[PDB]
Amino acid sequence: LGGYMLGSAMSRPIIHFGSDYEDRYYRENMHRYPNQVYYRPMDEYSNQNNFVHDCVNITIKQHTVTTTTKGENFTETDVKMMERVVEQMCITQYERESQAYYQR
């Protein structure tokens, strides 16, 4: 961790995958997923998508570290599923501040 921090909070955004074991499985266990993200406020990056790429990869990995520092490890399944949800949260915060970066 080279100097990231958290981002804002919201509702848990939903993303299908087209298969029961992914559409349902995320649903069963979204009650244990995040509700905030990890990023740095605009110091060095300003894409929409790629700003979220970095952020997501971090918030995600941080859940994996947090499990391992307790004595557990997530899977590719639980990680791919966060790549969706953390993204939507990182875009939804990006929007909610890039609104004010613009509207001035």
Swiss-Prot record:
Disulfide bonds join C55-C90. Changing E95K: Confers relative protection against sporadic Creutzfeldt-Jakob disease (CJD) in the heterozygous state. Changing G3V: Protective factor against Kuru; protective factor against prion disease; confers protection against classical Creutzfeldt-Jakob disease (CJD) and Kuru in the heterozygous state but can be infected with variant CJD prions resulting from exposure to bovine spongiform encephalopathy prions; confers complete resistance to all prion strains when homozygous; acts as a 'dominant negative' inhibitor of prion conversion; is not only itself resistant to conformational conversion, but also inhibits conversion of wild-type proteins. It is found in: Cell membrane; Golgi apparatus. Changing T64K: In early-onset dementia and dementia due to prion diseases. The glycosylation pattern (the amount of mono-, di- and non-glycosylated forms or glycoforms) seems to differ in normal and CJD prion. Glycans are attached at N57, N73. The normal, monomeric form, PRPN(C), has a mainly alpha-helical structure. Misfolding of this form produces a disease-associated, protease-resistant form, PRPN (Sc), accompanied by a large increase of the beta-sheet content and formation of amyloid fibrils. These fibrils consist of a cross-beta spine, formed by a steric zipper of superposed beta-strands. Disease mutations may favor intermolecular contacts via short beta strands, and may thereby trigger oligomerization. Contains an N-terminal region composed of octamer repeats. At low copper concentrations, the sidechains of His residues from three or four repeats contribute to the binding of a single copper ion. Alternatively, a copper ion can be bound by interaction with the sidechain and backbone amide nitrogen of a single His residue. The observed copper binding stoichiometry suggests that two repeat regions cooperate to stabilize the binding of a single copper ion. At higher copper concentrations, each octamer can bind one copper ion by interactions with the His sidechain and Gly backbone atoms. Its primary physiological function is unclear. May play a role in neuronal development and synaptic plasticity. May be required for neuronal myelin sheath maintenance. May promote myelin homeostasis through acting as an agonist for ADGRG6 receptor. May play a role in iron uptake and iron homeostasis. Soluble oligomers are toxic to cultured neuroblastoma cells and induce apoptosis (in vitro). Association with GPC1 (via its heparan sulfate chains) targets PRNP to lipid rafts. Also provides Cu(2+) or Zn(2+) for the ascorbate-mediated GPC1 deaminase degradation of its heparan sulfate side chains. It is linked to PrP is found in high quantity in the brain of humans and animals infected with neurodegenerative diseases known as transmissible spongiform encephalopathies or prion diseases, like: Creutzfeldt-Jakob disease (CJD), fatal familial insomnia (FFI), Gerstmann-Straussler disease (GSD), Huntington disease-like type 1 (HDL1) and kuru in humans; scrapie in sheep and goat; bovine spongiform encephalopathy (BSE) in cattle; transmissible mink encephalopathy (TME); chronic wasting disease (CWD) of mule deer and elk; feline spongiform encephalopathy (FSE) in cats and exotic ungulate encephalopathy (EUE) in nyala and greater kudu. This protein is produced by a bicistronic gene which also produces the alternative prion protein/AltPrP (AC F7VJQ1) from an overlapping reading frame. The alternative prion protein/AltPrP (AC F7VJQ1) and PRNP have no apparent direct functional relation since a mutation that removes the start codon of the AltPrP has no apparent effect on the biology of PRNP. In mouse and hamster, the alternative initiation AUG codon is absent and is replaced by a GUG codon. Monomer and homodimer. Has a tendency to aggregate into amyloid fibrils containing a cross-beta spine, formed by a steric zipper of superposed beta-strands. Soluble oligomers may represent an intermediate stage on the path to fibril formation. Copper binding may promote oligomerization. Interacts with GRB2, APP, ERI3/PRNPIP and SYN1. Mislocalized cytosolically exposed PrP interacts with MGRN1; this interaction alters MGRN1 subcellular location and causes lysosomal enlargement. Interacts with KIAA1191. Interacts with ADGRG6. Belongs to the prion family. This is Major prion protein. It comes from Homo sapiens (Human). The chain holds residues 125 to 228 of 253 of the full protein.
